[PDB]
Structures are given as structure tokens and as C-alpha cells.
């Protein structure tokens, strides 16, 4: 059943495309924090 | 049916590209946090 099949994909790509941001925003955070402890360790 | 059928294919494309994406962000995270603990297992020799 296709228009259920289509309804499955659009629902998983939903939830899929706001788990990706959440993770993106978390490693962004990440990377900046990381950054700032490698500069403090070069800088003292 | 032949539309919807295309559709379906290109749905399938599109939800493994963003697996594939969530994927690549958490091999991403792993090496930040694995270099996050090196240079915090440096600075707390140093400290000492």
C-alpha cells in the first residue's frame, strides 16, 4: 500500500531531519568547547 | 502509480541521506570527544 509506504518515509525523514539538527547544534557546542580548552592549553 | 512509485524510490534516497548525515555527525562527536578527553588528560598533568 503505496500512500501508506509514502505516509512511513515522510514520517521517518520528519523525525530523522529534527534528530540531525539537535545532534549538528550538540557537536557545534562541542567543537567550540573543544576549541576553547585546546587554545587555553597553547595560551597557559 | 507510476508517479507515486518514483516518489517512493526517491523518499527511500532521501530518508538514507539523512541516516547517512546523523551518521557522519555522531563519527564527528566521537573524535571531538575523544580529543577533548587528550587535551584534558594534558592539562591536568600540567596542573599537577
Given at each position: 500500500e503505496l500512500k501508506?509506504?509514502?505516509e512511513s518515509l515522510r514520517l521517518k525523514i520528519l523525525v530523522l531531519r529534527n534528530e540531525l539538527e539537535r545532534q549538528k547544534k550538540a557537536?557545534?557546542?562541542?567543537?567550540?568547547?573543544?576549541?576553547?580548552?585546546?587554545?587555553?592549553?597553547?595560551?597557559? | 502509480?507510476?508517479?507515486?512509485?518514483?516518489?517512493?524510490?526517491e523518499?527511500?534516497?532521501?530518508?538514507?541521506?539523512?541516516?547517512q548525515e546523523l551518521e557522519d555527525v555522531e563519527k564527528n562527536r566521537?573524535?571531538?570527544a575523544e580529543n577533548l578527553?587528550?587535551?584534558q588528560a594534558e592539562?591536568?598533568?600540567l596542573d599537577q
Amino acid at each position: 500500500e503505496l500512500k501508506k509506504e509514502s505516509e512511513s518515509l515522510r514520517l521517518k525523514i520528519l523525525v530523522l531531519r529534527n534528530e540531525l539538527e539537535r545532534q549538528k547544534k550538540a557537536l557545534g557546542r562541542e567543537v567550540a568547547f573543544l576549541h576553547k580548552q585546546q587554545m587555553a592549553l597553547q595560551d597557559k | 502509480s507510476e508517479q507515486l512509485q518514483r516518489e517512493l524510490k526517491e523518499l527511500a534516497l532521501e530518508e538514507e541521506r539523512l541516516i547517512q548525515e546523523l551518521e557522519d555527525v555522531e563519527k564527528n562527536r566521537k573524535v571531538v570527544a575523544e580529543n577533548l578527553e587528550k587535551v584534558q588528560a594534558e592539562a591536568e598533568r600540567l596542573d599537577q
